[PDB]
Amino acid sequence: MDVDVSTDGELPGAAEYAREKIGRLSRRAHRPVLHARVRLTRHGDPAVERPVIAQANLDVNGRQVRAQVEGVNAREAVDRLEARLRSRLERIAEHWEARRGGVPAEAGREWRHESEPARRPGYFPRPPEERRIIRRKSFSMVPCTVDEAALEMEMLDYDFHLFTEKGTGFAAVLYKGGPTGYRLVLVIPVPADELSPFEKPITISTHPAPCLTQRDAVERLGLLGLPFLFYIDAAEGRASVIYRRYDGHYGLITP
RNA sequence: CGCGGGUAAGACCGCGUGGAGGCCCGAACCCACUUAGGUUGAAGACUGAGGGGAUGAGCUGUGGGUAGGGGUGAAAGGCCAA
RNA sequence: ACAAACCAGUGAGAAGCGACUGUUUACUAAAAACACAGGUCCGUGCGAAGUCGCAAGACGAUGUAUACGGACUGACGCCUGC
RNA sequence: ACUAUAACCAUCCUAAGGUAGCGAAAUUCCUUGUCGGGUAAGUUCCGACCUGCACGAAUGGCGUAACGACUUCUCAACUGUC
RNA sequence: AUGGUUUGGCACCUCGAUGUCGGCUCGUCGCAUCCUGGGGCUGGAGCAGGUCCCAAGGGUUGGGCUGUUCGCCCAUUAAAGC
RNA sequence: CGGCCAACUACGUGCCAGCAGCCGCGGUAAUACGUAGGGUCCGAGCGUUGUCCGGAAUUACUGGGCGUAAAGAGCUCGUA
RNA sequence: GGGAGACUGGAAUUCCUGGUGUAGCGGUGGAAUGCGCAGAUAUCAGGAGGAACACCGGUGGCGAAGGCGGGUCUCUGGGCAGUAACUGACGCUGAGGAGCGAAAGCGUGGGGAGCGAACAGGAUUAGAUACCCUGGUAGUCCACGCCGUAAACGGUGGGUACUAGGUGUGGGUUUCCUUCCUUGGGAUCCGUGCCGUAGCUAACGCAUUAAGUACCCCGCCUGGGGAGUACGGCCGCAAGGCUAAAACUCAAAGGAAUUGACGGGGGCCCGCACAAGCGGCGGAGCAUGUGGAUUAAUUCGAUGCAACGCGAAGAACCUUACCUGGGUUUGACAUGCACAGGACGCCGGCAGAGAUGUCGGUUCCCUUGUGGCCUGUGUGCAGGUGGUGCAUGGCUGUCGUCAGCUCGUGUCGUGAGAUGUUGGGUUAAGUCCCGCAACGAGCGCAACCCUUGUCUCAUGUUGCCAGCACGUUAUGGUGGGGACUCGUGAGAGACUGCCGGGGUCAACUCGGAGGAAGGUGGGGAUGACGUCAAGUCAUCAUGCCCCUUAUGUCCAGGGCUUCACACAUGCUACAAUGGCCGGUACAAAGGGCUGCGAUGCCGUGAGGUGGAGCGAAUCCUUUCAAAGCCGGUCUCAGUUCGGAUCGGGGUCUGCAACUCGACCCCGUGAAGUCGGAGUCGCUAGUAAUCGCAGAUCAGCAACGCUGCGGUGAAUACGUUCCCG
RNA sequence: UCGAAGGUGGGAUCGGCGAUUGGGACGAAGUCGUAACAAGGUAGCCGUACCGGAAGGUGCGGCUGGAUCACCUCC
């Protein structure tokens, strides 16, 4: 490390002492230092109790660390400047050991500015305690085609819709298939040829709607995280679509 | 163990009965620490003064067992007929 | 001169070693050496492990892991690091 | 920040580099180490320093009441040891 | 240049045996003299020394520490000889 | 003779010499240092030191307190 | 869930055994030690063992306190309510004393799944005896005993009586709604919380569960350290516990609350702050400034933003304040008190580097009292870029053109202080609206000013020329003309003015029409209270101190330009989006009298001669430019790039270009191949790039500064990170 | 007989010195670190135990005299 000292007036021996005292702080800086300068001045007025003024500037990897002290002589000023610079460099570290106690920790305990925001679902929580099923629509079970079902979707502003298919005579549910288009799920999977003709670009889910109970359906919805579950009820034997409502209850659509 | 004091009861504290201990002093008995004598000796390991243990891991009597590259050894290369 | 003869503890302070009573080179060494009560580790599930025996057989033990054998250390106190 | 040492740092090597405790000691050659006590005079003794040639934790480390025909130093009495 | 009083060198001397240091007791000899005795010069004023010649008749202490010889110390003494 | 605490200016000096009961004054322009004027309090006296009481309700009987300033025993039973 | 004892239940962790089964598992902010490939992790079945008891489960219950919940049984303590049968003050407190007393720790004997001091490695770090990771001994567990400490806290000793209430919740008795289901409600006793009177307190706060009003008893305190320490004593196996000083030292240590400041606290916002981009710096040569070194001197000031092409808008001499040397002293220059005068003053010669000295010619007008000049003699005095910007004024920077900073009266608090200035919304804004113990006001914001973008009226010279004539190439050049520009006077025009929609029908906001311009149109001038003892005693002034035969003053020469290095700001480049040559088209602004200076002529070219015309809308700076466009050539090379350095020859200014000017000509032809860590500027006529002009100026170090125009981009998803 | 003084002996108690050695107070500027105060960058403190050049670290139990928890849609 190389230091330049720009003294002023009569300060014999201050330059060497300041150089050798400040150059020892290179190991303290955790990043390479560049062009570290020091300046010594003396107050002309004898009325000042601490006439000597010392200033130091270091460029630690682009970060400017500067300090300034007053003293009665060159030696005291240089020593105080060294202590001040050491404290500043300690507060500057920014390496992991010095930035590990401020990084957000745990999952829910403690909150910080950069702590990860809580993931909130669209629905009101309404935990399993008194969740209940307080919405049961049975809008339409008149047979429809894919295009007619899509239009019945669109003006209802509902992502999924349960109807009964024209060609099959079976219950089916359409939903937005994402970027792939739309997706159709039937109680028993059938190919497109048996399905009534359509013009919208859709795809058919190959899996069949399984048979399961109400509590099992709620458990599957909870452990599978889908926006809804389409299934054949075990007791009823017919189609059913459960979705988490906008109040936290489950919306069971039945024929 | 008993009596008394003490306490709610004790703990505990005094006074007695008791006779424990590889306990103390010290004869027989068993050892052998010091010194002097002896050193062609009274004696092929003793004597005179002192000395240690002396109810025990004690001493001793009679009978018996372990045998040589083996015995036995509170361990010294000790003893196993000077 | 009155424990008149014989008989019959010298005492105190400190340090080292070994806790202590004991044992040891019969015949130049009795000690700080051996042993000891206590501690730890290892082996042994039962004619055990170990030992004496070519084998039978025997001790271990007429015992059974709170028992037996081997090794080191040596009361007791504070400990026993890598 | 006088001088001194070095709380501290760097480096090589190892499996690890001796912690507690003690130290001119039954270990220390230099050595009759240096200081204090004891004596008129103390190479022995006691207390301390640590520079441990070459202490050190069950080949145990440091202490310890009681005990010792063990070793060393001092005192009082006592005496033909003188 | 002397000496064989110091450590040495050789190994002629003894392994069918010549005690190895100090201390005690008892000596004898040399002088390269510590005191006493006789002188010289003094950088000897006297005192007292310094130093050097002659001189071996006599004398040349008791203790502390250490096994000590050696050595240091304590009191003396005419001196505390080699 | 800065404020407590009556009584201010000039010169000399400059973190020195020094002052001081406390707070605190000496850093070329000090009403706090030294000297001069001026002033004030006392006056055959004036100040300093030493000791006791008061102010000190600062051992609180008159006349104090204990949540956070010092202060409720860790909690009960019970002898005088 | 008060305590003790005994028996016993399930989930889960660990380990073992046996199947299926592969190549990873585990761990972190990221990894590595570690485990596994000899079969791990995962999954199933079985077995062994230890500890703790999910849900119930809470500011809910019990207990004197510590503390106490898997289930069942046995033994046992306390409390509450009602009846009031019973005894009849037997009550309260309690020095010492005894007992209980979390966790950790100690002793003996067991047990040991998980966790885990100590201890190992792994990781982070400049260093990690730590935080994080992999293992892991005591211990945590049981039995019998020790110790006797805790933030053992409600930091609040025990008993009693009284002093507004409101509302949760636990337990028990009873009256009335009455279904009598129902926290129905009421009354009452005993607990346990929250809010709030009076009252108390320094305040925070307590407030029927007192920290209120009083009575009885006990414990404890007398400033902070030294110190709950030493000595002595008691207890303890030990760790240690209890009782418990002094010397010395400090002038404070403390409790509550207020205003700031700060935070690796939170929330809401801004800014080329970041993000997306474009061009750079840091690498090379040169110009400039600074540090350091050097020197006789390298004059002085300026040290992050906010010093470092700054004071310096012009250092050869002068400047100049520094050095060497030479002179000078009422002085280089002012003004007053005096004595003598007619000269001061000039002009030539000589000596000197010059200052200066000397020589030669010239000599006052008033008016009699003297005045103007200087001489010397003097005497007051001048003169200091000598010190102190921590004594100052004035001037300036900066936070920051950010939106904030205060005051009057009122109100609250003992007081510092608080409200207003906070809250919701909105804005570029403390801008505004709605609320509000506040009502108003001031400096700040905005507006009023300049420029710029459109139009109207006025306006024609030196400015335009559209329609008419003359023109000679040479063109508004010339007569003429207001028509279009332009020049400069007045005015209009943007005001959410209008419409539609959000909006508390409020501020304000989104879109649309119109217009040249739409929402402070674009850019300026303007910088609140103050901060940083910021800068300036060197623009100037100035209190105090200092020099005064000198730190004043005159002159010559030199220095400020020195250079083994370091930092900063810029310029030129490293080339083909280019170099060179030829042709050719478009600006704005500004300057000019002892200055701009043309035509012509002479030089290759700086330049020389010469002087037309101009105090300038006229003449000159050329009619003005360069990038640009067209044509030719070069062909990816240290080159036809780059220009440094050096040799020679000249011009101009200046008394004088050696130290130390610029430019011109010939030759010479270095580094340099797009530049590490890091870092800067910029949101549109902007960055980038090209040229022109001005100040200072005899000449220039100008590549610097201040302006003018030419050509003219990319990107902005959005505030997580950096700075303010 | 009692009896002052004196002699002998073992203890008590109060002080002084003491080689070496422990801690305390203060000292602008020395060396090594960042422990605490803003969540002080690992919340702090109390009792206890172990470890470490040093502040300190960790284990068990306890206390708040510890900071923050945006947004939060149903109603």
mmCIF file of all heavy atoms in Angstrom, chain G residues 323-334:
data_model
loop_
_atom_site.group_PDB
_atom_site.id
_atom_site.type_symbol
_atom_site.label_atom_id
_atom_site.label_comp_id
_atom_site.label_asym_id
_atom_site.label_seq_id
_atom_site.Cartn_x
_atom_site.Cartn_y
_atom_site.Cartn_z
ATOM 1 P P C G 323 12.841 36.281 -0.483
ATOM 2 O OP1 C G 323 13.277 35.874 0.875
ATOM 3 O OP2 C G 323 12.647 37.719 -0.797
ATOM 4 O "O5'" C G 323 13.883 35.682 -1.528
ATOM 5 C "C5'" C G 323 14.408 34.372 -1.370
ATOM 6 C "C4'" C G 323 15.488 34.090 -2.384
ATOM 7 O "O4'" C G 323 14.927 34.144 -3.719
ATOM 8 C "C3'" C G 323 16.638 35.085 -2.419
ATOM 9 O "O3'" C G 323 17.618 34.813 -1.433
ATOM 10 C "C2'" C G 323 17.158 34.953 -3.844
ATOM 11 O "O2'" C G 323 18.001 33.818 -3.966
ATOM 12 C "C1'" C G 323 15.871 34.679 -4.620
ATOM 13 N N1 C G 323 15.291 35.894 -5.238
ATOM 14 C C2 C G 323 15.860 36.424 -6.401
ATOM 15 O O2 C G 323 16.864 35.875 -6.874
ATOM 16 N N3 C G 323 15.304 37.524 -6.963
ATOM 17 C C4 C G 323 14.223 38.079 -6.417
ATOM 18 N N4 C G 323 13.701 39.162 -6.995
ATOM 19 C C5 C G 323 13.621 37.554 -5.239
ATOM 20 C C6 C G 323 14.179 36.468 -4.695
ATOM 21 P P U G 324 18.579 35.980 -0.896
ATOM 22 O OP1 U G 324 19.408 35.410 0.195
ATOM 23 O OP2 U G 324 17.754 37.188 -0.650
ATOM 24 O "O5'" U G 324 19.543 36.282 -2.127
ATOM 25 C "C5'" U G 324 20.496 35.322 -2.557
ATOM 26 C "C4'" U G 324 21.313 35.838 -3.713
ATOM 27 O "O4'" U G 324 20.480 35.957 -4.897
ATOM 28 C "C3'" U G 324 21.894 37.229 -3.541
ATOM 29 O "O3'" U G 324 23.055 37.261 -2.734
ATOM 30 C "C2'" U G 324 22.123 37.665 -4.980
ATOM 31 O "O2'" U G 324 23.281 37.043 -5.515
ATOM 32 C "C1'" U G 324 20.897 37.066 -5.666
ATOM 33 N N1 U G 324 19.781 38.037 -5.737
ATOM 34 C C2 U G 324 19.775 38.954 -6.770
ATOM 35 O O2 U G 324 20.645 38.990 -7.620
ATOM 36 N N3 U G 324 18.711 39.825 -6.772
ATOM 37 C C4 U G 324 17.679 39.861 -5.855
ATOM 38 O O4 U G 324 16.777 40.692 -5.960
ATOM 39 C C5 U G 324 17.760 38.883 -4.819
ATOM 40 C C6 U G 324 18.781 38.026 -4.796
ATOM 41 P P G G 325 23.270 38.476 -1.706
ATOM 42 O OP1 G G 325 24.491 38.192 -0.912
ATOM 43 O OP2 G G 325 21.982 38.727 -1.011
ATOM 44 O "O5'" G G 325 23.582 39.718 -2.653
ATOM 45 C "C5'" G G 325 24.746 39.721 -3.463
ATOM 46 C "C4'" G G 325 24.654 40.717 -4.590
ATOM 47 O "O4'" G G 325 23.484 40.452 -5.408
ATOM 48 C "C3'" G G 325 24.483 42.173 -4.202
ATOM 49 O "O3'" G G 325 25.670 42.787 -3.737
ATOM 50 C "C2'" G G 325 23.943 42.777 -5.487
ATOM 51 O "O2'" G G 325 24.978 42.906 -6.449
ATOM 52 C "C1'" G G 325 23.001 41.667 -5.948
ATOM 53 N N9 G G 325 21.630 41.909 -5.469
ATOM 54 C C8 G G 325 20.954 41.326 -4.425
ATOM 55 N N7 G G 325 19.745 41.805 -4.278
ATOM 56 C C5 G G 325 19.622 42.764 -5.276
ATOM 57 C C6 G G 325 18.546 43.620 -5.625
ATOM 58 O O6 G G 325 17.430 43.714 -5.101
ATOM 59 N N1 G G 325 18.865 44.433 -6.710
ATOM 60 C C2 G G 325 20.066 44.421 -7.374
ATOM 61 N N2 G G 325 20.212 45.268 -8.400
ATOM 62 N N3 G G 325 21.072 43.631 -7.059
ATOM 63 C C4 G G 325 20.782 42.837 -6.011
ATOM 64 P P G G 326 25.568 44.022 -2.716
ATOM 65 O OP1 G G 326 26.917 44.271 -2.150
ATOM 66 O OP2 G G 326 24.427 43.753 -1.805
ATOM 67 O "O5'" G G 326 25.169 45.254 -3.643
ATOM 68 C "C5'" G G 326 25.978 45.617 -4.752
ATOM 69 C "C4'" G G 326 25.273 46.572 -5.682
ATOM 70 O "O4'" G G 326 24.070 45.961 -6.219
ATOM 71 C "C3'" G G 326 24.775 47.869 -5.070
ATOM 72 O "O3'" G G 326 25.799 48.829 -4.889
ATOM 73 C "C2'" G G 326 23.703 48.300 -6.060
ATOM 74 O "O2'" G G 326 24.295 48.854 -7.225
ATOM 75 C "C1'" G G 326 23.083 46.952 -6.428
ATOM 76 N N9 G G 326 21.919 46.645 -5.582
ATOM 77 C C8 G G 326 21.824 45.670 -4.622
ATOM 78 N N7 G G 326 20.661 45.643 -4.031
ATOM 79 C C5 G G 326 19.944 46.664 -4.637
ATOM 80 C C6 G G 326 18.618 47.116 -4.415
ATOM 81 O O6 G G 326 17.784 46.692 -3.609
ATOM 82 N N1 G G 326 18.294 48.182 -5.248
ATOM 83 C C2 G G 326 19.135 48.737 -6.179
ATOM 84 N N2 G G 326 18.661 49.760 -6.901
ATOM 85 N N3 G G 326 20.371 48.325 -6.396
ATOM 86 C C4 G G 326 20.707 47.294 -5.595
ATOM 87 P P G G 327 25.701 49.889 -3.687
ATOM 88 O OP1 G G 327 26.829 50.843 -3.828
ATOM 89 O OP2 G G 327 25.527 49.133 -2.421
ATOM 90 O "O5'" G G 327 24.349 50.677 -3.982
ATOM 91 C "C5'" G G 327 23.866 51.668 -3.088
ATOM 92 C "C4'" G G 327 22.743 52.458 -3.709
ATOM 93 O "O4'" G G 327 21.793 51.553 -4.322
ATOM 94 C "C3'" G G 327 21.900 53.290 -2.754
ATOM 95 O "O3'" G G 327 22.496 54.535 -2.438
ATOM 96 C "C2'" G G 327 20.581 53.424 -3.500
ATOM 97 O "O2'" G G 327 20.668 54.432 -4.496
ATOM 98 C "C1'" G G 327 20.486 52.068 -4.198
ATOM 99 N N9 G G 327 19.661 51.100 -3.454
ATOM 100 C C8 G G 327 20.076 49.910 -2.908
ATOM 101 N N7 G G 327 19.113 49.256 -2.320
ATOM 102 C C5 G G 327 17.995 50.057 -2.497
ATOM 103 C C6 G G 327 16.653 49.871 -2.075
ATOM 104 O O6 G G 327 16.166 48.926 -1.445
ATOM 105 N N1 G G 327 15.844 50.931 -2.465
ATOM 106 C C2 G G 327 16.265 52.029 -3.168
ATOM 107 N N2 G G 327 15.332 52.947 -3.450
ATOM 108 N N3 G G 327 17.512 52.215 -3.565
ATOM 109 C C4 G G 327 18.316 51.197 -3.199
ATOM 110 P P U G 328 22.402 55.119 -0.945
ATOM 111 O OP1 U G 328 23.113 56.422 -0.918
ATOM 112 O OP2 U G 328 22.793 54.039 -0.004
ATOM 113 O "O5'" U G 328 20.850 55.407 -0.739
ATOM 114 C "C5'" U G 328 20.173 56.373 -1.527
ATOM 115 C "C4'" U G 328 18.685 56.322 -1.287
ATOM 116 O "O4'" U G 328 18.170 55.036 -1.710
ATOM 117 C "C3'" U G 328 18.253 56.436 0.166
ATOM 118 O "O3'" U G 328 18.188 57.777 0.612
ATOM 119 C "C2'" U G 328 16.903 55.736 0.173
ATOM 120 O "O2'" U G 328 15.890 56.600 -0.321
ATOM 121 C "C1'" U G 328 17.128 54.626 -0.854
ATOM 122 N N1 U G 328 17.507 53.336 -0.235
ATOM 123 C C2 U G 328 16.527 52.612 0.413
ATOM 124 O O2 U G 328 15.379 52.999 0.517
ATOM 125 N N3 U G 328 16.943 51.418 0.947
ATOM 126 C C4 U G 328 18.212 50.886 0.888
ATOM 127 O O4 U G 328 18.437 49.796 1.415
ATOM 128 C C5 U G 328 19.166 51.690 0.193
ATOM 129 C C6 U G 328 18.789 52.858 -0.335
ATOM 130 P P U G 329 19.386 58.399 1.479
ATOM 131 O OP1 U G 329 20.241 59.203 0.568
ATOM 132 O OP2 U G 329 19.987 57.306 2.284
ATOM 133 O "O5'" U G 329 18.654 59.396 2.480
ATOM 134 C "C5'" U G 329 18.100 58.921 3.697
ATOM 135 C "C4'" U G 329 16.615 58.692 3.581
ATOM 136 O "O4'" U G 329 16.361 57.474 2.832
ATOM 137 C "C3'" U G 329 15.877 58.486 4.895
ATOM 138 O "O3'" U G 329 15.561 59.713 5.533
ATOM 139 C "C2'" U G 329 14.657 57.681 4.471
ATOM 140 O "O2'" U G 329 13.677 58.528 3.891
ATOM 141 C "C1'" U G 329 15.245 56.797 3.370
ATOM 142 N N1 U G 329 15.707 55.475 3.862
ATOM 143 C C2 U G 329 14.869 54.621 4.566
ATOM 144 O O2 U G 329 13.716 54.873 4.858
ATOM 145 N N3 U G 329 15.437 53.428 4.948
ATOM 146 C C4 U G 329 16.723 53.005 4.695
ATOM 147 O O4 U G 329 17.094 51.905 5.097
ATOM 148 C C5 U G 329 17.520 53.928 3.956
ATOM 149 C C6 U G 329 16.995 55.093 3.577
ATOM 150 P P U G 330 14.614 59.755 6.831
ATOM 151 O OP1 U G 330 15.021 60.936 7.630
ATOM 152 O OP2 U G 330 14.599 58.419 7.480
ATOM 153 O "O5'" U G 330 13.167 60.060 6.237
ATOM 154 C "C5'" U G 330 12.876 61.324 5.652
ATOM 155 C "C4'" U G 330 11.564 61.315 4.906
ATOM 156 O "O4'" U G 330 10.498 60.922 5.815
ATOM 157 C "C3'" U G 330 11.144 62.661 4.320
ATOM 158 O "O3'" U G 330 10.409 62.440 3.120
ATOM 159 C "C2'" U G 330 10.205 63.208 5.388
ATOM 160 O "O2'" U G 330 9.280 64.166 4.919
ATOM 161 C "C1'" U G 330 9.510 61.935 5.854
ATOM 162 N N1 U G 330 8.970 62.008 7.217
ATOM 163 C C2 U G 330 7.687 62.493 7.363
ATOM 164 O O2 U G 330 7.015 62.867 6.420
ATOM 165 N N3 U G 330 7.226 62.537 8.654
ATOM 166 C C4 U G 330 7.906 62.142 9.786
ATOM 167 O O4 U G 330 7.359 62.239 10.885
ATOM 168 C C5 U G 330 9.226 61.644 9.549
ATOM 169 C C6 U G 330 9.701 61.592 8.304
ATOM 170 P P G G 331 10.866 63.141 1.752
ATOM 171 O OP1 G G 331 12.200 63.757 1.964
ATOM 172 O OP2 G G 331 9.738 63.975 1.264
ATOM 173 O "O5'" G G 331 11.044 61.921 0.745
ATOM 174 C "C5'" G G 331 10.146 60.816 0.773
ATOM 175 C "C4'" G G 331 10.878 59.510 0.591
ATOM 176 O "O4'" G G 331 11.260 58.982 1.893
ATOM 177 C "C3'" G G 331 10.082 58.402 -0.098
ATOM 178 O "O3'" G G 331 10.975 57.611 -0.881
ATOM 179 C "C2'" G G 331 9.592 57.565 1.079
ATOM 180 O "O2'" G G 331 9.276 56.229 0.758
ATOM 181 C "C1'" G G 331 10.794 57.654 2.009
ATOM 182 N N9 G G 331 10.535 57.333 3.417
ATOM 183 C C8 G G 331 11.302 56.434 4.113
ATOM 184 N N7 G G 331 10.930 56.267 5.344
ATOM 185 C C5 G G 331 9.840 57.108 5.475
ATOM 186 C C6 G G 331 9.034 57.330 6.614
ATOM 187 O O6 G G 331 9.151 56.807 7.726
ATOM 188 N N1 G G 331 8.029 58.250 6.357
ATOM 189 C C2 G G 331 7.825 58.880 5.154
ATOM 190 N N2 G G 331 6.794 59.740 5.107
ATOM 191 N N3 G G 331 8.578 58.677 4.076
ATOM 192 C C4 G G 331 9.570 57.781 4.301
ATOM 193 P P A G 332 11.435 58.096 -2.342
ATOM 194 O OP1 A G 332 12.913 57.970 -2.419
ATOM 195 O OP2 A G 332 10.790 59.401 -2.638
ATOM 196 O "O5'" A G 332 10.805 57.009 -3.318
ATOM 197 C "C5'" A G 332 10.771 57.215 -4.722
ATOM 198 C "C4'" A G 332 9.481 56.705 -5.308
ATOM 199 O "O4'" A G 332 9.193 55.392 -4.758
ATOM 200 C "C3'" A G 332 8.243 57.523 -4.981
ATOM 201 O "O3'" A G 332 8.079 58.645 -5.828
ATOM 202 C "C2'" A G 332 7.128 56.497 -5.105
ATOM 203 O "O2'" A G 332 6.825 56.250 -6.469
ATOM 204 C "C1'" A G 332 7.806 55.257 -4.534
ATOM 205 N N9 A G 332 7.584 55.134 -3.083
ATOM 206 C C8 A G 332 8.523 55.217 -2.087
ATOM 207 N N7 A G 332 8.031 55.065 -0.884
ATOM 208 C C5 A G 332 6.677 54.872 -1.103
ATOM 209 C C6 A G 332 5.601 54.655 -0.228
ATOM 210 N N6 A G 332 5.735 54.592 1.099
ATOM 211 N N1 A G 332 4.375 54.501 -0.769
ATOM 212 C C2 A G 332 4.245 54.563 -2.098
ATOM 213 N N3 A G 332 5.179 54.764 -3.024
ATOM 214 C C4 A G 332 6.386 54.912 -2.453
ATOM 215 P P C G 333 7.548 60.036 -5.227
ATOM 216 O OP1 C G 333 7.454 61.011 -6.343
ATOM 217 O OP2 C G 333 8.361 60.359 -4.028
ATOM 218 O "O5'" C G 333 6.067 59.704 -4.741
ATOM 219 C "C5'" C G 333 5.075 59.287 -5.666
ATOM 220 C "C4'" C G 333 3.753 59.045 -4.985
ATOM 221 O "O4'" C G 333 3.880 57.978 -4.012
ATOM 222 C "C3'" C G 333 3.201 60.210 -4.183
ATOM 223 O "O3'" C G 333 2.563 61.174 -5.000
ATOM 224 C "C2'" C G 333 2.264 59.524 -3.197
ATOM 225 O "O2'" C G 333 1.019 59.225 -3.812
ATOM 226 C "C1'" C G 333 3.001 58.209 -2.930
ATOM 227 N N1 C G 333 3.783 58.244 -1.674
ATOM 228 C C2 C G 333 3.114 58.034 -0.466
ATOM 229 O O2 C G 333 1.891 57.830 -0.487
ATOM 230 N N3 C G 333 3.808 58.057 0.694
ATOM 231 C C4 C G 333 5.120 58.279 0.675
ATOM 232 N N4 C G 333 5.767 58.295 1.841
ATOM 233 C C5 C G 333 5.830 58.495 -0.541
ATOM 234 C C6 C G 333 5.130 58.469 -1.682
ATOM 235 P P A G 334 2.289 62.652 -4.438
ATOM 236 O OP1 A G 334 1.943 63.529 -5.585
ATOM 237 O OP2 A G 334 3.415 63.021 -3.544
ATOM 238 O "O5'" A G 334 0.989 62.477 -3.541
ATOM 239 C "C5'" A G 334 0.585 63.497 -2.645
ATOM 240 C "C4'" A G 334 -0.423 62.985 -1.649
ATOM 241 O "O4'" A G 334 0.085 61.794 -1.003
ATOM 242 C "C3'" A G 334 -0.746 63.924 -0.500
ATOM 243 O "O3'" A G 334 -1.708 64.898 -0.863
ATOM 244 C "C2'" A G 334 -1.228 62.979 0.594
ATOM 245 O "O2'" A G 334 -2.595 62.649 0.405
ATOM 246 C "C1'" A G 334 -0.387 61.728 0.325
ATOM 247 N N9 A G 334 0.761 61.563 1.241
ATOM 248 C C8 A G 334 2.042 61.228 0.877
ATOM 249 N N7 A G 334 2.874 61.111 1.880
ATOM 250 C C5 A G 334 2.086 61.373 2.991
ATOM 251 C C6 A G 334 2.386 61.405 4.365
ATOM 252 N N6 A G 334 3.601 61.162 4.862
ATOM 253 N N1 A G 334 1.383 61.696 5.220
ATOM 254 C C2 A G 334 0.167 61.938 4.715
ATOM 255 N N3 A G 334 -0.237 61.937 3.447
ATOM 256 C C4 A G 334 0.781 61.642 2.618
#
